[PDB]
Design a protein around this ligand. Structure first.
Ligand SMILES: Nc1ncnc2c1ncn2[C@@H]1O[C@H](CSCC[C@H](N)C(=O)O)[C@@H](O)[C@H]1O
Ligand SMILES: Nc1ncnc2c1ncn2[C@@H]1O[C@H](CSCC[C@H](N)C(=O)O)[C@@H](O)[C@H]1O
Ligand SMILES: Nc1ncnc2c1ncn2[C@@H]1O[C@H](CSCC[C@H](N)C(=O)O)[C@@H](O)[C@H]1O
Ligand SMILES: [Mg+2]
Ligand SMILES: [Mg+2]
Ligand SMILES: [Mg+2]
Ligand SMILES: [Zn+2]
Ligand SMILES: [Zn+2]
Ligand SMILES: [Zn+2]
Lengths: 453, 453, 453
């Protein structure tokens, strides 16, 4: 009945985890000093919830799986494991070591069949087995009814889902980080509760953001480069850092998982789909998607995000490789701190005064990390000024001033308070959805040797 | 079950050690007044962790070993001991004395075989034995599956790892000091928790750094030297001082162990490798490396360091041999002190006022060592000034001012706050990897005599 | 198991002794009012430690021995006792009186053999006995494996060690005062914890140092001496005063025991040696040296000293024989007092204000002796001023100003704070190492008479 998580017993993150999973009993049990403990704990509880919701005797496809995590489960899993990332050969070896070390000791699980399944694929790397295959999400031929994506960011969502549906899959799950900051087109940001920072490739030489490195210099003037950049806008390449682990991502694929509430898949076969968010905790979400045959209803093309805590996006000034520039940064703010600044923001406040007030509220144990305070104080100061300016320029009801050209005002801060919602327009009608092993002889030999005894 | 460390029972370092090794029970037991006790305690616990992680019945290679430390272990070690440093003949003699004094009293360990192995090498200094050899890491011929580097700074990392891999090694470990300050190209620095200071060879005659010596003088003017230095930049030679022990190092070899998360080794045989940091405590780290046959995935070439406490690098002014100069210095700062200065650094503060505030926070028992306070106060003062200057020179969004030449600003301080990450670009594709005994007759005779009874 | 020392039970020096020897149990037992009690207690515990570290059944050479101290030991000692100092005939008589008064009452020790050994030497003053001889460290012919130097300052270290190594000695120990202040070339200094003061011969007529004497005078003007001194620099001759005992020393021989960590001895036979400091307590140290045959590794030539408390060296003004001059003085400062002055020294302070603050911290029982306070207060005041001047003359990074001749600044104070290290360059490659009884008939007759009954 209880669930054990590898976190410290005095951690403040334990209370937030309990609030997000009211149907479990969470107990701390620390064994390792892993620096991504909070992120791993959330994903561990997410899989437990999914298994409870679905019924036994169901076949589940695990896309981009790590087979060692499913070894001690009593459900039927079919692991789809292509070898496309540099961390994959190590995961395969860890799978074989755990299997051989448990043979003859665990009897409830189908240990013998799993070992037999692995050997068959090694001899002929083209056969489908009940528990293992070497194909991709498009070229796999096994039929099931449930599909699971756990921390997968490298596929195009409408294309991948369509190939799952024509094989009889009616339910899908997606676990990962929130995609909202990438719909606002920010240049850098943070997930402070999970010790996570990300940044665009062009600003990796900044000075005062979470993920950067710079140098000491005296300051020259020439730097004669005739070719002009003249413009600095976000590009596709993005670097992620969870704890001390680095992951490169792509903006196009990240935004493709920001699906609307209702959409249609039109091809040789047609489907009507629905997307819903069931769990949310300070940047991690769980999504649930259903698919049914036929075309019903109509679509609007809107996606909605509910904010339990504050969300900020502001303009900041920094030096990149010694040159002063400006770009945008986003972050999350705890709800208690947001509610205690309502009275202060009724008037204009300087950034220096806001910083001192935030320190007093925080260090009263820290509610929020201290390295994000300076940019939050700057954002709050500009938001109050812009609100004050609006009240002093009252317009008339039901008219638009166009004396024909209109002026556009300047906006430096976007602040979504708790209990508010964001809404964006995306595509909702899809009608376009258009193999080698990759294993080497030395790797196949090594896997066989570990399995023998 | 408990682990004993040779430190004082009232030491404040005991709490930090407990937090870094949650899977053990640490108990103090002081027997000697060793002045490098904290450094020795970390290395003692690191080896215990490694043995627990790996499975028995495995062959382990100990590169650059001190065989006396492995004499009471129940695992199979193969010590690779060339004689290339002046401290090696003493280590060999200590090994023989401990073996002869334990013969006939310890039976669990393979004492008799170890004595027999040592005698065979003395007669013919070219044979490989199960527990001992006189070759280097390149010319050894024994095959194993685990390799361990404990405080080894004298080898080129990609070259050494490649020769280990072609012999069947799949796992490697490296224990030593953090290499991050040498990637920032500092001239001097400190590791205050371990009583360690280091400096470049050119600044050994300074006045107010950790490792220096100078004289008294009245001040002359001529010093007529026509040849001009005209420039002062870091060189290859670096001196280390742990407690009262001196060690010379080389900058090129130190930086070669700052490996990226993913890299390839291309030669007659090809391998794909991964590097990860598992333990970190105030500048002391443990790294884990895996190697697999074949080429998979792609590489980016980025190395990431996670900061649990503050990291600083600043410009300082001193007199070297009576002449005033300027260079850079780095150090580490405890996290609690960093969090308590957030409010103060919101405005501009003089170096004198910052020093008095730091003393009040520290001496409230000392959290940090007092001899690094003056340079920390100066570094904090310049960081606050530069942040204020950036806020008063706001630019426009998405543009670069190039009215074509751009001006570069001056930077005097780099400050990495807790819960932030550094990132550097390094090489990740390697394709180039290109014997005598050294023992003397008098030394061989002495070893034989100690072994006889 | 316990060790007894002849010091007062309420002395504050007892705590420092316990910290330096954690492996013993120290108990006070006062029997005499000796004024060099602290220095004698340290040497007593040092010999006990050495006996524990080495194994029984080993032959030990005692260079420059006092044979009465080794009379009640159960180990095998070979006392090398030439008669070259005026205190030697008295030490020999004390040896004979104790032997005759213990015959027939002590049975565990080899009392009968020691008495027989003494008589043989008197008849023929050229024979080597297992426990006694009349030669020097160069002309002795006994072979052993351990050598001990206890408060010996009258030999050249590289020459003495070479003659010990060719006789089969592999380990050596040296006990004495710290040689660091003589590497800085000071004119006078103190060891306040041991009631020890030393001074150069040229300043024995000063007024306000530890070891001096002067007269009252009204002040004349002529003193017509055509020959000009014109210069005052340290010379070879130095006087020591431990308690109320006077010892003359030589600067050349004192500096020869400041050995580097690694050095080579090259001659007919070659050796590789290593030096290490194992005990340190407020200026009193124990050194351990090992020697092995052959040539291995390379040398740098650096010697390192670790400071557990503060070390000072400053400029002072005094009248010598009525004439005002200036010279340098060194001393030691307790660590607790050093840590409490960090805040004060952030700004400029006058010598008068510094003296009052030091008195308040000290007399709050005395942590430090009051007669050294005036020179410590003056040294602190000048150090703060010089640091302030450096901050106001900032230079540029990586360049040297030589507009070609450069100016040298004035330095009046050297301050080594606790947890710092000194480093000096010394010689590390040695290749040059190039008898009468002295007893009288009346002395031999007296020794024989005391032995008979
Ligand atoms: N087109 C595709 N179809 C199926 N799997 C793919 C794929 N492209 C990449 N992958 C796999 O998806 C994996 C993402 S890494 C995720 C591993 C695992 N889910 C975990 O939580 O640790 C990679 O190992 C890669 O091999
Ligand atoms: N190329 C090489 N291959 C293998 N060992 C080497 C080597 N170059 C130097 N060494 C050895 O590496 C040692 C480093 S000193 C480290 C000793 C031991 N690991 C300890 O913890 O104390 C030296 O003794 C030197 O003999
Ligand atoms: N060249 C030499 N070789 C051996 N002994 C010498 C020597 N020159 C001087 N000595 C002896 O060294 C002694 C130093 S006095 C030290 C005595 C004794 N170790 C103690 O602690 O009391 C002198 O008595 C002198 O006789
Ligand atoms: Mg990891
Ligand atoms: Mg040592
Ligand atoms: Mg006396
Ligand atoms: Zn499949
Ligand atoms: Zn070998
Ligand atoms: Zn002799």
């Amino acid at each position: 009945d209880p669930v054990y998580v590898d976190i410290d017993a005095d951690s403040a993150f334990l209370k937030a985890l309990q609030r997000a999973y009211p149907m479990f009993e969470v107990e701390p049990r620390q064994v390792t000093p892993n620096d991504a403990a909070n992120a791993r704990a959330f994903s561990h509880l997410a899989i437990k919830l999914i298994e409870q919701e679905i019924d036994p005797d169901s076949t589940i496809l695990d896309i981009g799986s790590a087979p060692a995590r499913r070894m001690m489960s009593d459900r039927k899993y079919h692991c789809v494991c292509p070898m496309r990332s540099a961390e994959d050969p190590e995961r395969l070896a860890n799978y074989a070591r755990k299997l051989a070390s448990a043979a003859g000791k665990v009897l409830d699980r189908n240990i013998s069949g799993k070992i037999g399944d692995l050997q068959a694929v090694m001899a002929v790397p083209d056969t489908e087995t009940p528990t293992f295959c070497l194909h991709t999400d498009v070229s796999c031929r096994q039929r099931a009814d449930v599909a699971i994506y756990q921390d997968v960011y490298a596929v195009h969502a409408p294309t991948s889902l369509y190939h799952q549906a024509i094989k009889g899959v009616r339910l899908a799950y997606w676990v990962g980080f929130d995609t909202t900051p990438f719909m606002y087109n920010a240049m850098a940001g943070a997930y402070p509760s999970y010790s996570t920072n990300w940044a665009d490739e062009q600003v990796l030489k900044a000075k005062n953001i979470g993920l950067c490195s710079t140098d000491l210099t005296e300051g020259r003037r020439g730097k004669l480069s005739i070719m002009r950049g003249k413009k600095l806008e976000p590009c596709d390449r993005v670097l992620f850092s969870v704890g001390s682990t680095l992951y490169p991502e792509s903006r196009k694929l990240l935004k493709s998982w920001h699906l609307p509430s209702v959409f249609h898949l039109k091809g040789k076969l047609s489907f009507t789909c629905r997307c819903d968010t069931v769990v949310s905790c300070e940047g991690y979400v769980v999504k649930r998607i259903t698919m049914s045959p036929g075309l019903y209803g109509k679509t609007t093309g809107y996606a909605v995000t509910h904010h339990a805590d504050g969300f900020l996006m502001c303009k900041t000034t920094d030096t990149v490789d010694g040159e002063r520039v400006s770009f945008s940064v986003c972050t999350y703010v705890p709800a208690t701190i947001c509610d205690q600044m309502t009275g202060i923001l009724a008037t204009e406040v300087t950034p220096e005064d806001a910083q001192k007030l935030l320190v007093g509220l925080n260090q009263r144990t820290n509610t929020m990390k201290n390295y994000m305070i300076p940019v939050v104080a700057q954002a709050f100061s500009k938001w109050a000024k812009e609100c004050r300016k609006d009240m002093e320029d009252e317009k008339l009801l039901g008219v638009r001033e166009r004396t024909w050209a209109f002026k556009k005002q300047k906006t430096h801060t976007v602040y979504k308070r708790p209990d508010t919602q964001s809404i964006q327009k995306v595509q909702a009608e899809f009608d376009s959805f258009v193999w080698s092993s990759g294993l080497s002889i030395p790797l196949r030999t090594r896997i066989k040797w570990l399995l023998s005894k």
